[PDB]
Amino acid sequence: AQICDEALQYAARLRELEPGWSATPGCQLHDAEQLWLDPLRAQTDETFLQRRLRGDWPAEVGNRFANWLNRAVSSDSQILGSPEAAQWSQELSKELTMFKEILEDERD
Amino acid sequence: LSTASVLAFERKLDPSDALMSAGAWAQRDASQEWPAVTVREKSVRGTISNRLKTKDRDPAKLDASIQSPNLQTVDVANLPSDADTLKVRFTLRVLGGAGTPSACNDAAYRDKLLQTVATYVNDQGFAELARRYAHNLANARFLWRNRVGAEAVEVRINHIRQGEVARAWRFDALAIGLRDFKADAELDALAELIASGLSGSGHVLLEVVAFARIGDGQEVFPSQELILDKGDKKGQKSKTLYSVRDAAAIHSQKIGNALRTIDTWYPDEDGLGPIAVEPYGSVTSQGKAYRQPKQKLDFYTLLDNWVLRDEAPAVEQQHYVIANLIRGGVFGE
Amino acid sequence: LSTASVLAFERKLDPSDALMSAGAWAQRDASQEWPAVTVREKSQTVDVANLPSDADTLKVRFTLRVLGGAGTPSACNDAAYRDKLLQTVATYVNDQGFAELARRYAHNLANARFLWRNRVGAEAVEVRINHIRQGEVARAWRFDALAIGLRDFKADAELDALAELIASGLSGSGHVLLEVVAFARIGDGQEVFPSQELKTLYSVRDAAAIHSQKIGNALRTIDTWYPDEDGLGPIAVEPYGSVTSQGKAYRQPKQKLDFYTLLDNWVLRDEAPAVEQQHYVIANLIRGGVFGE
Amino acid sequence: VTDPEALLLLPRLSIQNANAISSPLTWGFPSPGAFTGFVHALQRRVGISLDIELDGVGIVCHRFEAQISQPAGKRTKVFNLTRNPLNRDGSTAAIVEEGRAHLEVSLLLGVHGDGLDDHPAQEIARQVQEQAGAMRLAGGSILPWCNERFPAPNAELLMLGGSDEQRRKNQRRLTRRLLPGFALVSREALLQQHLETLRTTLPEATTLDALLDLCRINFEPWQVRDKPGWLVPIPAGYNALSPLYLPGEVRNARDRETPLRFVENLFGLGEWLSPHRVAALSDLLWYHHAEPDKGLYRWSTPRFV
């Protein structure tokens, strides 16, 4: 629950005081980062694209964050047979459920 | 005795990557310069028809998904629209010497294993396994999706010693079944060659060419390449086909899978088709693992109980153990 | 007992791409070698597809390979769910063949729906259909596409003989390969409608063409078994049957007519739908796709 | 401690030269008594004219920049002073030390009065910010905006009515505009918890905060003692050490019509939290409350848990 909100702290600091954010410097694997941590700009900037005007379900970067949360724990081999990782999967599940709903209104 | 902590067997029956080319049928006797199947891309728009999410039964959420379709860029591989035959060509090389590992810690466990395998070979050669590998060269098992739904499939196998065909073979891959391994006066001419290759008595290099009439402008199915993230759906995020030097090709390990599907032995299948020879013998598409480790038919169970504890398995299962040493692997601990 | 998490169904009735070529009407005798239709520009830079002005007839040609064996999934986790799925189709096929399905498939080749925006506005459309057991044609056909109704399905002894061929392919009785050739009077130098690339046009040998899946969408408008209304004509057989141009869907999961809800009843829950509803269940197994959990 | 009807939001208050000493012991962010006395000064000036009750106050603190420097070789950090005008003789001035910190806070409020029913929502938020521009929060000025004009307007949520869905989606709109900060509450119960935990010895309440302003590198039975949050020492209030005087019997008062007591400060515990952690934002408010019979004069966040 700290990390679910620390990323939100990381989101708003990157959102604030950077209006000139764009995709052109150094993009190799940064998909939908223009969609979630965008500059709102009071306008859209698009020519051969329609996605920039609005936004719905920015969840794949949250799933990639959820794929990072499985990578965040380093190594534990005795947790798979126990239901502790099944409890941790619920810990992964009950915090993304809060995380997706918070993440909606930045684009919904 | 104890097992070596590292065992590394180099593989035998080492295939190559098969190119694909197309042409007209009855020009297959002069298929020296057919044009290769080129991978090309197209634009695919499809609706959202998938397994429904839990507690998501809202009809407007269905209807809003119609307003957001799936613009999607794939690549495909069709034949030239005048051609109907698919020429697939690769070169299989038989190495031989399946007993000796590359890396091995214990010198005593190595020397016991070499006496164990040489006991097998002198009692019975590789001609039982080479009877079974010759069928997967006979029937076009390496035509994975392309064989399904064909009028005629014809397989030509050439033995090349120098840069010259020493002996040809001519096979009808549809008359020969896909499940049953019947003997032949023509298959045993090719099975004695592979058994001589695996035993190390000579050199075997086979040129495998398989023709298959499909139709005018239909679709061939090369192996599919893993895709990294590059942005949105446009940019071939969906599907990328394997191609080397602009020719739609099949991976070698897919063909190397399709050769070693000889294991008709099982826990619980009488005649339901052979499985690929795997430790923990499994099928990725079927999802289930036959030959479970709690069952004693496991490769790691049978091998350790024959080299350390020195009792023979069933001869029914002894042909399984040697076939896992021909494909190689990272064995041991 | 339950559906497997992986259900991949290899599709059947596999089409190809459709080459386009011009030519004059009543030149159908020597109609083999035509010049095709290229993709040029006009100015702001767009890509248009037009006939050579001396010709009036679009020629469309693709091939169709009827595979059959519609019950077996290509990938399935559990075998008991796999076996009873094969038992359920064996219940279907023994009770009735693929004939009523294929007779509705026999229409979509005759009245050329694969001429999507080309049939509307035409005045004379003729479709050739040939069965090729070898390189030779073993069985030929000849069908008007405007006399056979686009919105209403009617039977014919020529169609039913063609329907039994596609029924023989889907049941696995043999090999069925088809050569569909469509001549259509549109006019001199008119705008034909190829498939729209994501904006160029889909050309292959610099010859403008239609996608293969955009033809197969036209060969499966069989589902007249709506929840709501058959008055709008047939619609392509899809799970959660929906049309992008009309915008709305049909066959909601709140309705009990959903393909997933039907399949769980017809296989797992042993609850048979109507015989008219059974044809919708099988015609998505010919479509194929990733099913299950 | 009355439950608020509305929630007035002061969006991004940039604060120049605020105080940073805040107690005789706890340097840093200024005292929460400065914020509770600030809202009572708005209730003094505005809330009697709009007929509203401004009682609670939330603390967000988007940016804290203190004027400190550590000297060469030390690790403790000393303050930056300022010059003063000279003496009568013009020799030099004596040195007093005053901490000094720039600051950027946001202030939730609580409204109770009938002026919500009379004045519209924009009229409430306009009269407050136009007054609060020409005032002082922690002994320092309040600065206006320039060059991008984005964070200027206020907000107000009538969180008295509506269904629990209508609150909770609207509540997630304030947490957007409070997101780069860190909300501040008092934890009076954790200090009561760890005193009863530390009963192997006989410690004091002041000896517990020294074990919460910690880096207790514990030797193995090496390791660092864990923290359940960003626990921090705050001044909790005041505690009187003198009897209650008549208004006209103490020399050099501010005014001669209010009673006086000499008090101490009074130290407590506080935790800095993200605004998405707390479920109900009305629990976040600081309420000054005091019983004048004995000597307590404190402030806290009630109803928090």
Next chain:
RNA sequence: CUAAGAAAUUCACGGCGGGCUUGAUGUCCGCGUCUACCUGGUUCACUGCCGUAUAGGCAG
């Protein structure tokens, strides 16, 4: 109705001379990535226009 209320640290400066980082090394061995799809949601609210004047066989 605020640990309330008030406040100029300033001026000036040479961092600089010198330097051998070397020697040697086996990354091995094994693998199935599959299954489906309408881009006819305008590639300039437009490509030529009598007068930008909702003026058109407008090429619609």
